[PDB]
Amino acid sequence: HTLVWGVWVNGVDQGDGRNIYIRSPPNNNPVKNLTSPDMTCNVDNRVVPKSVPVNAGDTLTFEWYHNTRDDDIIASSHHGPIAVYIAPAASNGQGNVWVKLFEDAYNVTNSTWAVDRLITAHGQHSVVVPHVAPGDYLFRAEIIALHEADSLYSQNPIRGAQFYISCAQITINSSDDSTPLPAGVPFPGAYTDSTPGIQFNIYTTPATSYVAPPPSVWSGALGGSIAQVGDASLE
Ligand SMILES: OC[C@H]1O[C@@H](O[C@H]2[C@H](O)[C@@H](O)[C@H](O[C@H]3[C@H](O)[C@@H](O)[C@H](O[C@H]4[C@H](O)[C@@H](O)[C@H](O)O[C@@H]4CO)O[C@@H]3CO)O[C@@H]2CO)[C@H](O)[C@@H](O)[C@@H]1O
Ligand SMILES: *[C@@H]1O[C@H](CO)[C@@H](O)[C@H](O)[C@H]1NC(C)=O
Ligand SMILES: [Cl-]
Numbered sequence: 001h002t003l004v005w006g007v008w009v010n011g012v013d014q015g016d017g018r019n020i021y022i023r024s025p026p027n028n029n030p031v032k033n034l035t036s037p038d039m040t041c042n043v044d045n046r047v048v049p050k051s052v053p054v055n056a057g058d059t060l061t062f063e064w065y066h067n068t069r070d071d072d073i074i075a076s077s078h079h080g081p082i083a084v085y086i087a088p089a090a091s092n093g094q095g096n097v098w099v100k101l102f103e104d105a106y107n108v109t110n111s112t113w114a115v116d117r118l119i120t121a122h123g124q125h126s127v128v129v130p131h132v133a134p135g136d137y138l139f140r141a142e143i144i145a146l147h148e149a150d151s152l153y154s155q156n157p158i159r160g161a162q163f164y165i166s167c168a169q170i171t172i173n174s175s176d177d178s179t180p181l182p183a184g185v186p187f188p189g190a191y192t193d194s195t196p197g198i199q200f201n202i203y204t205t206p207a208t209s210y211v212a213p214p215p216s217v218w219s220g221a222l223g224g225s226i227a228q229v230g231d232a233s234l235e
């Protein structure tokens with residue numbers, strides 16, 4: 001169980017964003033139903049009042065918490081990958097609009113899942129804002145926890161892959177638009193019971209074998225990290 005508190009821009013904390021620039025759900029409960037509209041931006045998907053300003057090139061940092069800011073972040077059992085997508089806010093998540101900007105499953109060297117490292121990075125991970133058409137966007141951060149993913153939720157509703165999904169409202173101001181945004185995949189829709197990465201047994205299968213659900217990272221993506229950029233206790 002985990003939620004997003006706010007975002008940083010170029011290492012500058014933008015302040016508490018809950019129900020403000022984040023479309024926050026009432027709680028940190030997982031989404032599990034792959035066909036639910038809840039797969040779009042979780043269970044309380046609606047325009048919230050503000051939208052964070054950025055430029056192409058900027059480093060946008062998501063910040064997750066479990067119960068309170070800079071706490072244990074998310075329970076260690078919840079091993080899994082992490083993705084970020086983007087879409088035009090016009091679409092409100094609907095249609096085939098979602099383009100992936102980032103992916104991190106398992107790191108062979110360090111021998112840690114993305115989530116493992118997110119605990120260590122005080123709940124912070126980042127992407128570099130791409131050169132798309134200025135305007136309003138949604139950035140969808142997605143944690144998949146696989147602690148019960150040896151079953152499918154459709155066949156057993158008290159197990160299955162767990163999605164922790166958070167949509168941030170981001171306004172891109174300065175960009176030259178050298179890589180305009182493509183069409184994307186829909187959510188719900190893009191993940192099924194048969195998609196790879198959705199059913200997987202982390203107790204028997206070695207993490208090295210894990211393949212994250214498609215789609216692939218779009219070519220116009222600029223990376224890419226899971227690491228603390230800010231100190232929240234300093235404020
Ligand atoms: O460890 C491997 C084993 O895991 C089993 O699944 C466990 C998870 O390991 C465990 O982390 C998970 O814990 C949940 C708990 O079920 C929730 O009820 C609880 O919900 C809290 C929330 O954390 C709070 O922040 C919020 O304020 O309130 C709610 C209500 O109390 O959150 C924790 C995680 O933080 O429980 C799972 C099952 O109970 C697998 O099932 C097993 O197969 C694996 O071998
Ligand atoms: C999953 O969501 C779909 C779409 O809202 C709904 O028809 C279905 O009842 C849900 N299934 C599970 C068991 O709930
Ligand atoms: Cl859980």
Ligand SMILES: [Cu+2]
Pocket residue numbers: 001002030075078
């Ligand atoms: Cu949980």
